[PDB]
């Protein structure tokens, strides 16, 4: 049914924005690692970026992709600037968190929660 | 303007809910039932959407009840089945709607107990 | 019974400023300086 | 134990409510003076800049200051968020409420042009509820953490969030961690089941 | 009701009796509403309960001390709006605002009566009926409570 | 009513230059601080002359005991249903006398806010909030009070609590 | 005359009677292009008229002020100039039209 | 330019601020204050707490003004219930509201000075503030976040000696003000640091929603205690201290005058406080007295229900603003029929003021910014909420 | 209590009378243990005194233009102290 | 062992807590102190029990010492009353 | 309560109480962090001053970590520490021989006593940490001693886990650092120029995760282990890798071990802490070990972390400003050896 567009009209039109963000992030990862004295490698980080831009790679409601960009850009602003410290950026890497197993037998074997 | 889209408006990616709390979690739309202990029917009129019950364990030091289910104390209150199914679908949770159970009309008469 | 203003009112408190204007005048002030400063030269 | 009230106000303001409804018929959906003697003009979201400009700059209704901009979230309503703008007229010593409705994915305009007070309040509404304000200079998180994910004051967000922080020696940084609370918050179902006679 | 009291006189007291090991009848609480007498006589067919005496010392308790032994017994608790007679096992373990209430099914018997399990901080504190017109219409067995 | 707050002959011009050149106006401040080294400091000798308080002072919690020796707490749960910091857990039982008492009581004193909503709700005057305020601790565990660090606590200050209750009961 | 209008920014305006007549008269015109029966034109022309009516009936500023019931005239102007801007802005937003869209159902029922 | 993030820990301001600055050489090109360093979630938590058990959220919003924050909520919850506090309680709230304005201003004027570098004014006044705390401790029980101005009244009557002791403090406090007065009002150093710094024009102040001494300092006439009176202020006489040349100094001078005008209001409240009870006594709203709940059943039931469940205020919504010492403090309380609120938007005089920092501190050096925050009397509890 | 010379030092240096307005409480203070108090407490049907139920759900509502309320009367300078 | 048990089993690792420390345990058990009290003899069928106080004690409840068979015990003080 | 009853994280419980004796130094602060994040109680016996045990107090949750004072000279301190535990871990070990304690004591006598009480108290596991390539007649006073003890441990408390780690790298290490420190004094005076001697280095966390997994792994009983690490590097290359990553000039001028032995002697003489000493010098140059057949981290469940990766974190400090900002890809690439 009809819906007002947030910023883009067709999913294709919007994707134009999604790519104009990917590029931005990609061209920024290198800078961050150095500026925030992060320890992860440029390649490693750039991987994360794709992962995320990829995680959201299934929605088709332009309005949603028009919205995730914005949220997305905002996250650059902060990261481009150093408004975010090392702690903030490094949180995208679950360094301490032990990744949860997924195998049923691997979960049944630990924790009553599914 | 007025673009047209055909989704169930899944804002699952705008909500910000960790995947595992948007994937393996079942909301249960239902109109709360009456507290048999009282006869007030004002707490059985609005549809609630409560989530599944996960681990409630014991803090080793003081014996308090501890938990890791962030969405445990969550009881959203709607006003109709239609508006609850919509919210759950909107947020990407699985639902288990339970139809309302209004008492049927039972005819009561004072004299009846005097017949023989 | 119950704390209540003393019968007849508490009394008057002053609130307005009282920073008190005072001091030597200028003509006089300077004339002691120069008078102390010519004596330093003689 | 019954408020000392003036009926003059109910009437005077009611009359202004009809005035505003007559002057702006295209955007105002419902005007009502509540019994608390306050006024509420409910406008279609498109009327956010027209309705507020008329009130900021009209001789018979000057509403110069924006007291606050907030968004109640009633999850049931289709358009959940109900942005509410409370405005004050220093000239006529009276106050007005203009409230409009916005959904998760439909942004409403920004009044920063009408009142520069809103530059910050609109950022807080985005951070807290996720409503987006069109052509708003510098919209970005005012209150939440730099990396916070999720809009907190939404009724569908867990009181205590999903992440907490701690210092991990092994990594020498303040690391996040899925929330484990040592005492869940006892949720009390305190709400009587005998309704009050209206 | 009323914000204040005008009863500046002396209250009455009745004598706690033993109606069983399931129902704690602190009947000085009783508002002589005769729900108990009826349930005991119209749902459970056990007409052991009854009113004795007239005036302000009408006490609704068994004239001779004979326990109210029947299934369907615990329902009296749920049906007395006053807390005169309440449950003896769940005497003082909790207080209702705290109890988180999860709606589930009776497995003790095959009628599959609907029931609400009231859990506090993770251990069940009481199971009380929830209404199902067709299966258990507001009542549950002494066993499954 | 409104009040304005901030709104040349040679006599005035010289006066202005006598207050700018031979500063005379920063001197009215130096004499102003000279007026205070000669006054009596307000400092109290702290450890020996503790400052003044009121019988209303809300501090370390304590469970009062009936003069007979019977705990006053009858496990109502009328004091965690109001405790806004959500600090109290008072799991109870029949105590095997047939009576009604706690097996559990708790405050996490690192969550409490000393608001006294627990001493004014208690219909029996069991939980109070004593006039202690020297109970700092080197550890986190010494603040999660149990029923026995509140009952012997109340077996300590009862000479000092009851005077303040009896002193303020009418106003409450 | 007046040394300073209290408010910091608003500066004393000589020729108050004149500045106003121009601003008020311009406005009385911009309203003209408004639809015949548009509340704005019907009401704002009712106000602007009364103020132009006094702006020319009384030549003492302090007096004038009391009549226009505003603050310092330097303010009555500030406002006269803004209504003009709203009047221009209103003629574009065409507020007089029929409601854009009725609220979705139950979008204004508080005890939900 | 140079992005020097003013210290979040920096001793200046209230220590909960960042204020990234662009340093164009010595002067500051732009300020982008990054508040959020103290957002505890006050408005989220209140939705999960009953109306009585949320009052405390309020004395902890602007911890310098304790009982005036509460007086807002208390006014808001009263209007939703259509009940009014008893006459004595209303005078007590005005008595305590003026003691809070003196203590907020002693906080604002003296801390501004230590930021500027004057250290002694803080010490002389803070001893005068400990005397005032003692008044809160001797009526509520706490020296802070008293939780005394509850819905329907104050929680307990004034102790038998409080009004005499408030007279003795108010009697001698005036000398303490001008003692600070002589120290800072005429000094070359203070006037240069404060005069013509952060001038805000009248229309800009209204547009930026300043609404406080910042509004009155620029000459706009608005107090909210004489424009939209609350409680019994309509029966007490005082003069709003408006000012011209909206500059830090004029704003300082206004804050010193309001301390003096508050002594005039405190003087009237002690002289004319009525005999009566301190809380409306329909037990449905304010809890029953300790003796009554222990002797009459209707009172035990009303005490049990009020403490355990709540007032259950009728469904509605209200925005009630009172003149808190900082400026207009308002609570937009949306209420379903339930005992616990649905939304409580705390309008903080301070969210608007800090927004003005970039406009007010333009063409100003690093040192001026320290004065600009000081003259907004911003405490980050209210801004962060 | 201070040597007169020392205190005249503080009165002259301050410029203000200082024995009168003490910042220290000697006998000015009310003594504690104030005598116990006795706080002050037909047709008192709650249905007549119902603040809670008295309120009603909000009212929803040639011609002359109407302002929200009559314009605010401008204040006037204080009689005791017009300028300070 | 506290008046309510709680004694840790020897094997319980929850005993380290008290190492180089000790256990806060109140020696004055109210189960016994109240038993060390004289049954309050009365003349009337029913008696009050304000908790030995008006507004400083417990809510006032009237107990029916009507059967010598049982000494009424106010649910608040645990005081037995001997008809 | 050996039944873990909670979602993994702080405030859960994995139900394994433990006495980790050397939890004041380098390896134990990571062990408590893992045992701790694993939410297991940890009775940490400390003979230190509390000011230095605080860094441990947050690596746990309310009540998880318990402290008590223990001095090796007296038992009953060993006894009460292990009295309520079921796991016991031994990390005691000192490079130098302080006047009061000999390699004898810190590596044999003491671990023996601890294990003595361990068996006496009924603890199931006595994870013990002896050095890799550390056997009798290994021509180094400590390593030899260390192995002597390994026996004493086995004898008294059989069915004990014995980990023998390779050189342990990681922040606050004294391996990479000792080499890095050479920058201060002249240049690296590597014996054999650093060639002819190869070392396998393992990250502290890799060892820590292994010890934690072992405490909870059933098959680990009575099992010795060698935590060698991913790559074998010749000493000259690793010092050169420490340099470049340290970003300071490198000079591997040679000299005989005997000289450096006599040399360190003096450094050992230092009263507070030897900067280096004969025993250390030996375990660096001559010490070289090829693991052959021992389970290892992979077996116990840890993927050994290469030194190529986590070397910033431990040498980013040793750089002068103007180089501190240097990234990793820039660091002088290293290379591995087999030998
Ligand atoms: C006719 C005879 C022949 C000719 C004779 C010579 C001609 C006449 C000479 C007259 C001299 C008059 C005094 C001139 C020296 C004093 C310093 C001065 O000139 O003032 C500068 C400054 C003024 O400040 P301001 O009001 O801002 O003026 C500038 C406005 N744009 O002042 C300041 O603001 C400085 C403030 C700094 C902080 C001061 C704090 C108080 C210091 C108290 C010191 C007390 C002890 C002093 C004596 C020490 C002795 C060793
Ligand atoms: N790279 C490495 O470090 C390697 C280590 N190992 C082995 O692993 C173990 C742990 O190594 P690491 O932690 O670095 O060694 P440390 O030098 O850090 O000492 C370990 C702990 O033992 C304590 N300790 C030392 N001497 C005594 C004593 N006489 N009495 C009581 N306590 C004592 C220390 O605390 P305090 O400050 O109180 O003395 C310290 O916290 C060692 O025993 C070592 O043999 C094996 C291979 C490589
Ligand atoms: C290091 C810091 C990590 C920060 C990473 C970054 O800031 C976070 C972020 O990715 S911000 C959200 C991005 N999310 C989108 O921009 C929407 C994508 N939209 C789709 O994916 C559609 O489904 C589509 C039809 C295009 C699939 O097509 P495709 O698979 O992309 O080709
Ligand atoms: S039901 Fe409860 S109250 Fe009504 S009579 Fe039987 S017992 Fe007394
Ligand atoms: S303390 Fe007072 S209130 Fe809390 S439970 Fe015991 S008795 Fe009831
Ligand atoms: S004081 Fe307030 S917070 Fe502390 S316990 Fe009593 S009620 Fe809960
Ligand atoms: Zn009793």
Written description of the protein model:
Chain C: Complex I is composed of 45 different subunits. Interacts with CARD15, but not with CARD4. Interacts with STAT3, but not with STAT1, STAT2 and STAT5A. Interacts with OLFM4. Chain C: Belongs to the complex I NDUFA13 subunit family. Chain C: This is NADH dehydrogenase [ubiquinone] 1 alpha subcomplex subunit 13. Chain C: The chain crosses the membrane at residues 24-42. This is part of a larger assembly, with eleven protein chains of eleven kinds. Chain B is α+β, with helices and mostly antiparallel strands and 116 residues long. Helices cover 13% and strands 18% of the residues of chain B. The radius of gyration of chain B is 21 Å and the shape is flat. Chain G has 112 residues and is mainly α. Chain J has one domain (1-83). Chain J has one helix and four strands; from the N terminus they run H-E-E-E-E. In chain J, the strands form two sheets. Chain J has a two-stranded antiparallel ribbon with strand order 1-2. Chain J has a two-stranded antiparallel ribbon with strand order 3-4. In chain J, a hairpin with a 6-residue loop joins strand 3 and strand 4. The interface between D and H is large, with 46 and 60 residues. Bound molecules: 1,2-Distearoyl-sn-glycerophosphoethanolamine, NADPH dihydro-nicotinamide-adenine-dinucleotide phosphate, the ligand CCCCCCCCCCC[C@H](O)CC(=O)SCCNC(=O)CCNC(=O)[C@H](O)C(C)(C)COP(=O)(O)O, iron/sulfur cluster (3 copies) and zinc ion.
**What assembly state would you assign to the polypeptide chains in this entry?**
part of a larger assembly
Q: State which percent range the strand residues of chain J make up.
A: 5-15%
Secondary structure class of chain K reads alpha/beta
State Rg of chain J: 19 Å
Helix/strand-derived class of chain J?
A: little secondary structure
How many β strands of chain K by DSSP?
11
Strand order of the largest sheet of chain K: 1-4-5-6-10
**Terminal CA distance of chain K:** 49 Å
Helix content of chain K: 25-40%
Tally of separate domains of chain J = 1
Number of strands of chain J: 4
Membrane topology (chain G): Peripheral membrane protein
Organism (chain G): Mus musculus (Mouse)
Keywords (chain G): Acetylation, Electron transport, Membrane, Mitochondrion, Mitochondrion inner membrane, Phosphoprotein, Respiratory chain, Transport
Subunit structure (chain G): Complex I is composed of 45 different subunits.
């Amino acid at each position: 049914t009809s819906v007002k567009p947030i910023f883009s009209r067709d999913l294709n039109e919007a994707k134009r924005r999604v790519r104009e963000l990917y590029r931005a992030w990609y061209r920024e990862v290198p800078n961050t690692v150095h500026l925030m004295q992060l320890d992860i490698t440029v390649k490693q980080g750039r991987d994360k970026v794709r992962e995320m831009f990829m995680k959201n790679a299934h929605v088709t409601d332009p309005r949603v992709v028009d919205l995730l960009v914005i949220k997305g850009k905002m996250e650059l602003q902060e990261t481009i600037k150093v408004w975010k410290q090392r702690t903030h950026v490094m949180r995208f890497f679950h360094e301490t968190e032990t990744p949860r197993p997924k195998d049923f037998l691997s979960k049944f074997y630990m924790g009553h929660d599914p | 303007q007025l673009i047209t889209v055909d989704e169930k408006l899944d804002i699952t990616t705008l909500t910000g809910v960790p995947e595992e709390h948007i994937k393996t979690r079942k909301v249960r739309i239902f109109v709360p039932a009456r507290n048999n202990m009282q006869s007030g029917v004002n707490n059985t009129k609005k549809w609630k959407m409560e989530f599944d019950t996960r681990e409630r364990w014991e803090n080793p030091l003081m014996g308090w009840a501890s938990t890791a289910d962030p969405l445990s104390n969550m009881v959203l209150t709607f006003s109709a089945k239609e508006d609850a199914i919509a919210f759950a679908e909107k947020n990407g949770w699985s639902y288990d709607v339970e139809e309302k159970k209004v008492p049927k009309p039972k005819s009561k008469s004072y004299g009846a107990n005097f017949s023989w | 019974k119950q704390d209540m203003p003393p019968p007849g009112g508490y009394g008057p408190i002053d609130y307005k400023r009282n920073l008190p204007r005072r001091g030597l005048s200028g003509y006089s002030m300077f004339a002691v300086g120069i008078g102390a400063l010519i004596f330093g030269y003689w | 134990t019954v408020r000392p009230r003036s009926d003059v106000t109910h009437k005077q303001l009611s009359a202004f409510g009809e005035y505003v409804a007559e002057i702006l018929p295209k955007y105002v959906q419902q005007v009502q003076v509540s019994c608390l003697d306050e006024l509420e003009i409910c406008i279609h979201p498109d009327g956010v800049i027209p309705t507020l400009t008329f009130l900021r700059d009209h001789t018979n209704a000057q509403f110069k200051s924006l007291a606050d901009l907030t968004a109640v979230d009633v999850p049931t309503r289709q358009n959940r968020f109900e942005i509410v703008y409370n405005l004050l007229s220093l000239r006529f010593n009276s106050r007005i409420r203009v409230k409009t409705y916005a959904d998760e994915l439909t942004p409403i305009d920004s009044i920063v042009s009408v009142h520069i007070a809103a530059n910050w309040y609109e950022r807080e509404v985005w951070d807290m509820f996720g409503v987006f304000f069109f052509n708003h200079p510098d919209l970005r998180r005012i209150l939440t953490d730099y990396g916070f994910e999720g809009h907190p004051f939404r009724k569908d967000f867990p009181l205590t969030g999903y992440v907490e922080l701690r210092y991990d020696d092994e990594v020498k940084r303040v690391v996040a961690e899925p929330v484990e609370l040592a005492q869940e918050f006892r949720k009390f179902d305190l709400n009587s089941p005998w309704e009050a006679f209206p | 009701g009323s914000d204040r009291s005008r009863f500046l006189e002396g209250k009455r007291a009745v004598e706690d009796k033993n109606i069983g090991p399931l129902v704690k009848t602190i009947m000085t609480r009783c508002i002589q509403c005769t729900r108990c007498i009826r349930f005991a006589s119209e749902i459970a067919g056990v007409d052991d309960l009854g009113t004795t005496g007239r005036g302000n010392d009408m006490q609704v308790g068994t004239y001779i001390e004979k326990m109210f032994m029947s299934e369907l017994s615990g329902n009296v608790i749920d049906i007395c709006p006053v807390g005169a007679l309440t449950s003896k096992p769940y005497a003082f373990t909790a207080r209702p605002w705290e109890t988180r209430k999860t709606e589930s099914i009776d497995v003790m018997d095959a009628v599959g009566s609907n029931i609400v399990v009231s859990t506090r901080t993770g251990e069940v504190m009481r199971i009380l009926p929830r209404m199902h017109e067709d299966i258990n219409e507001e009542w549950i067995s002494d066993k499954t409570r | 009513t409104y009040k304005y707050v901030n709104k040349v002959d040679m006599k005035s011009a010289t006066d202005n230059a006598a207050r700018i050149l031979m500063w005379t106006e920063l001197i009215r401040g130096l004499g102003m601080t000279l007026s205070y080294l000669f006054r009596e400091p307000a400092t109290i000798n702290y450890p020996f002359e503790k400052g003044p308080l009121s019988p209303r002072f809300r501090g370390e919690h304590a469970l009062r005991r009936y003069p007979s020796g019977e705990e006053r707490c009858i496990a109502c749960k009328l004091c965690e249903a109001i405790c806004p910091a959500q600090a109290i857990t008072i799991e109870a039982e029949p105590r095997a006398d047939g009576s009604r008492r706690t097996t559990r009581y708790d405050i996490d004193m690192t969550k409490c806010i000393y608001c006294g909503f627990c001493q004014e709700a208690c219909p029996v005057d069991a939980i109070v909030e004593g006039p202690n305020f020297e109970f700092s601790t080197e550890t986190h565990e010494e603040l999660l009070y149990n029923k026995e660090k509140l009952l012997n606590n109340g077996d300590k200050w009862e000479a000092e609590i009851a005077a303040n209750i009896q002193a303020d009961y009418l106003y409450r | 005359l007046k040394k300073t209008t209290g408010l910091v920014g608003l500066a004393v305006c000589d020729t108050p009677h004149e500045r106003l007549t121009i601003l008020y008269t311009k406005t009385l015109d911009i309203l003209k292009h408004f639809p015949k029966h548009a509340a704005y034109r019907k009401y704002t022309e009712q106000i602007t008229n009364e103020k132009l009516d006094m702006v020319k009936a009384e030549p003492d500023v302090k007096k004038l002020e009391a009549l226009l019931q505003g603050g310092e005239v330097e303010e009555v102007i500030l406002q006269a100039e803004k209504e003009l801007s709203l009047a221009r802005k209103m003629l574009k937003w065409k507020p007089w039209e029929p409601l854009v869209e009725e609220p979705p159902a139950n979008q204004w029922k508080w005890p939900i | 330019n140079m992005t020097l993030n003013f210290g979040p820990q920096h001793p200046a301001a209230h220590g909960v601020l960042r204020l990234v600055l662009e340093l164009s050489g010595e002067m500051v090109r732009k300020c982008d204050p990054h508040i959020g360093l103290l957002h505890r979630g006050t408005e989220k938590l209140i939705e999960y707490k009953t109306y009585l058990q949320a009052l405390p959220y309020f004395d902890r919003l602007d911890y310098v003004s304790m009982m005036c924050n509460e007086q807002a909520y208390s006014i808001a919850v009263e209007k939703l219930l259509n009940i009014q506090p008893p006459p004595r309680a209303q005078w007590i709230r005005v008595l305590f509201g003026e003691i809070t304005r003196i203590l907020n201003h002693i906080m604002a004027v003296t801390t501004h000075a230590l930021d500027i570098g004057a250290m002694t004014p803080f010490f002389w006044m803070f001893e005068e503030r400990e005397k005032m705390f003692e008044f809160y401790e001797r009526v509520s029980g706490a020296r802070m976040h008293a939780a005394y101005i509850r819905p329907g009244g104050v929680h307990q009557d004034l102790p038998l000696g409080l009004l005499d002791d408030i007279y003795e403090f108010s009697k001698n406090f005036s000398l303490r003000i001008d003692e600070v007065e002589e120290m800072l009002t005429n000094n070359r150093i203070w006037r240069n640091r404060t005069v013509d710094i952060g001038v805000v024009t009248a229309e800009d102040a209204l547009n930026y929603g300043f609404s406080g001494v910042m509004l009155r300092g620029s000459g706009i006439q608005w107090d909210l205690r004489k424009t939209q009176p609350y409680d019994v202020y309509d029966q007490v006489e005082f003069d709003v201290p408006i000012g011209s040349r909206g500059d830090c100094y004029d704003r300082y001078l206004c804050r010193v005058e309001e301390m003096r005008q508050s002594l005039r209001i405190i003087e009237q409240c002690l002289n004319k406080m009525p005999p009566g009870e301190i809380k409306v006594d329909d037990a449905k709203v304010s809890p029953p007295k300790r003796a009554e709940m222990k002797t009459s059943m209707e009172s035990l039931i009303h005490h049990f229900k009020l403490y355990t469940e709540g007032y259950q205020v009728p469904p509605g919504a209200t925005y009630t603003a009172i003149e808190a010492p900082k400026g207009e403090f308002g609570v937009y309380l949306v209420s379903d029929g339930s005992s616990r609120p649905y939304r409580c938007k705390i309008k903080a005089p301070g969210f608007a003021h800090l927004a003005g920092l970039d406009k007010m501190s333009k063409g100003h050096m690093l040192a001026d910014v320290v004065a600009i925050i000081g003259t907004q009397d911003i405490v980050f509890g209210e801004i962060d909420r | 209590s201070a040597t007169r010379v020392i205190q005249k030092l503080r009165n002259w240096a301050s410029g203000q009378d200082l024995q009168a307005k003490l910042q220290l409480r000697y006998q000015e203070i009310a003594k504690r243990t104030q005598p116990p108090p006795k706080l002050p407490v037909s047709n008192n049907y709650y249905c007549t005194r119902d603040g809670r139920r008295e309120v009603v759900p909000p009212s929803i509502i040639e011609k002359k233009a109407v302002t929200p309320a009559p314009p605010m009367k401008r204040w006037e300078l204080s009689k005791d102290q017009p300028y300070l | 062992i506290t008046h309510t048990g709680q004694v840790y089993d020897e094997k319980d690792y929850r005993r380290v807590r008290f190492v180089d420390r000790q256990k806060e345990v109140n020696e004055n058990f109210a189960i016994d102190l109240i038993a060390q009290q004289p049954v309050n003899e009365v003349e009337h069928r029913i008696i009050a029990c304000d908790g030995g106080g008006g507004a400083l004690g417990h809510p006032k409840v009237y107990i029916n010492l009507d059967k010598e068979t049982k000494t009424g015990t106010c649910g608040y003080c645990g005081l037995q009353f001997k008809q | 309560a050996v039944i873990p009853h909670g979602k993994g994280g702080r405030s859960s419980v994995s139900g394994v109480v433990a006495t980790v004796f050397g939890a004041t130094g380098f390896l134990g602060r990571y062990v408590v962090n893992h045992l701790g994040r694993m939410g297991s109680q940890v009775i940490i016996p400390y003979r230190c001053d509390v000011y230095d045990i605080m860094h441990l107090r947050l690596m746990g949750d309310l009540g998880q970590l318990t402290f008590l004072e223990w001095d090796a000279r007296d038992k009953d301190s060993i006894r009460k520490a292990v009295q309520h535990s079921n796991v016991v871990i031994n990390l005691i070990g000192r490079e130098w021989e302080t006047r009061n304690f000999d390699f004898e004591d810190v590596f044999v006598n003491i671990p023996r006593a601890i294990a003595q009480a361990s068996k006496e108290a009924g603890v199931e596991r006595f994870i013990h940490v002896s050095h890799l390539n550390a056997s009798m007649k290994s021509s180094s006073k400590s390593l030899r001693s260390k192995a002597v003890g390994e026996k004493e441990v086995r004898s008294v408390f059989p069915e004990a886990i014995i980990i023998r780690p390779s050189d342990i790298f990681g922040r606050e290490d004294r391996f990479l650092n000792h080499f890095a420190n050479y920058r201060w004094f002249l240049a690296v005076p590597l014996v054999s120029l650093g060639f002819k001697t190869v070392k396998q280095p393992v990250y502290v966390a890799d060892v820590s995760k292994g010890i934690v997994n072992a405490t909870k792994d059933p098959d680990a009983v009575g099992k010795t282990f060698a935590f060698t690490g991913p790559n074998r590097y010749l000493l000259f290359h690793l010092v050169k890798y420490i340099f470049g990553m340290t970003h300071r000039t490198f000079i591997p001028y040679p000299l005989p071990l005997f000289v450096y032995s006599w040399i360190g002697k003096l450094f050992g003489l230092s009263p507070f802490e030897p900067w280096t000493t004969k025993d250390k010098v030996e375990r660096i140059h001559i010490s070289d070990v090829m693991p052959t057949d021992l389970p290892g981290l992979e077996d116990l469940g840890v993927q050994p972390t290469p030194l190529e990766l986590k070397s910033i974190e431990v040498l980013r400090r040793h750089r002068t400003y103007r180089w501190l900002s240097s990234e990793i890809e820039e660091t002088k690439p290293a290379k591995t050896v087999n030998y």
